[PDB]
Design a protein around this ligand. Structure first.
Ligand code: DCT
Ligand code: MG
Ligand code: MG
Ligand code: NA
Length: 340
DNA sequence: AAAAA
DNA sequence: TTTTTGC
DNA sequence: AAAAAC
């Protein structure tokens, strides 16, 4: 069986037999993201992804024969881990002051690569020193990121994700009773934890205006209940979406009595719900490779809204994810097998 | 950093 | 070798 | 007026 270089042609389940290798490759990838080396970052993410798909652990260099996305640099890293159970390259990154600061600072909601680099060059090394500084000015996103830091840093579990699903569905059906709400992201792929809870909302009978107002109505409703801790709505991925922080009462889940949860809502037109569901189910790596496969192997363009055939100069229709896979000439990969 | 063009 | 990497 | 939310 020839392992494909594309995550969309691999079944990647949550039982990872090569976490010793992939934890090291994930660290090296993250460091290349920080050093703005996009190419080397992507090569380590693809190597890590292919090893996550293996149905067995790598125990010798012979085991890497025929595996794609493993060049000489990556094979040197694997060799070193086989040697003593550790990666000297990943260990050097874990001890690097810039890397430590970037991981720590970007762990705050509202802090990305640019702000983390700025704070590092200002001489900041701890979150306590950043928060207590009287000259720094924080965005509304960063204020929320610091205020709900401990809750957001400890990730969401499945009872919490299910409790959030109930809250989202309850709010959405009050303004659109025919609306279909689907939990997407990691949790749809069978993950037991996640940094956030994502939802795809669609309605078969809503108007263009009704579709536009739903996220504003749902967030105003939560604001009135005192459950909206943060809200950023992006007007109509070109679909209308919102990045939220919701107050999840402990009583709803099967101290302060509540937990701050990162929630993302995406609203899409009913017809395009298969493309949106596919795009928002992920994983990130699965999505990139789906689009890369479509471009390089089928001369097709795929995105969260549509599938276009560049040769035939026609858009291809789909009522399900299965139909999208069939258009692309791919065997159907179940959501729990997309953990690339 | 790896594979395609 | 140069180009591409989710355009 | 970037910058984050990727
Ligand atoms: N750079 C990205 C980020 C997100 N997504 C898509 C696919 C994953 C989906 C979910 O967004 P995330 O929450 O960032 O992904 P995740 O699977 O849900 O991871 P987590 O469980 O940690 O939230 O959106 C993507 O295609 N590319
Ligand atoms: Mg998610
Ligand atoms: Mg998300
Ligand atoms: Na962040």
């Amino acid at each position: 069986k020839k392992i494909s270089q594309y995550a969309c042609q691999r079944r990647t389940t949550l039982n990872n037999y090569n976490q010793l290798f992939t934890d090291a490759l994930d660290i090296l990838a993250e460091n290349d993201e920080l050093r703005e080396n996009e190419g080397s970052c992507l090569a380590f993410m693809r190597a890590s992804s292919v090893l996550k798909s293996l149905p067995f652990p790598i125990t010798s260099m012979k085991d890497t024969e025929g595996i794609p996305c493993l060049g000489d640099k990556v094979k040197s890293i694997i060799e070193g881990i086989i040697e003593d159970g550790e990666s000297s390259e990943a260990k050097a990154v874990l001890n690097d002051e810039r890397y430590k600061s970037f991981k720590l600072f970007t762990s705050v909601f509202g802090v990305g690569l640019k702000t983390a680099e700025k704070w590092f060059r200002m001489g900041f090394r701890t979150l306590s020193k950043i928060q207590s500084d009287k000259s720094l000015r924080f965005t509304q996103m960063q204020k929320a990121g610091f205020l709900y830091y401990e809750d957001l840093v400890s990730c969401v579990n499945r009872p919490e994700a299910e409790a959030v699903s109930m809250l989202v569905k309850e709010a959405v059906v009050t303004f659109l009773p025919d609306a279909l709400v689907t939990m997407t992201g990691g949790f749809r792929r069978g993950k037991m934890t996640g940094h956030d809870v994502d939802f795809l909302i669609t309605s078969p009978e809503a108007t263009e205006d009704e579709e536009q107002q739903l996220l504003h109505k749902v967030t105003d409703f939560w604001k009135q209940q005192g459950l909206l801790l943060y809200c950023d709505i992006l007007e109509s991925d070109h679909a209308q979406k919102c990045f939220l922080i919701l107050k999840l009462d402990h009583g709803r889940v099967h101290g302060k009595g509540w937990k701050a949860i990162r929630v993302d809502l995406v609203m899409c037109p009913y017809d395009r719900r298969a493309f949106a569901l596919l795009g928002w189910t992920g994983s990130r790596q699965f999505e990139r490779d789906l689009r890369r496969y479509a471009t390089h192997e089928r001369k097709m363009m795929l995105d969260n809204h549509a599938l276009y055939d560049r040769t035939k100069r026609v858009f291809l229709e789909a009522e399900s994810e299965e139909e999208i896979f069939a258009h692309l000439g791919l065997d159907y990969i179940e959501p729990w097998e997309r953990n690339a």
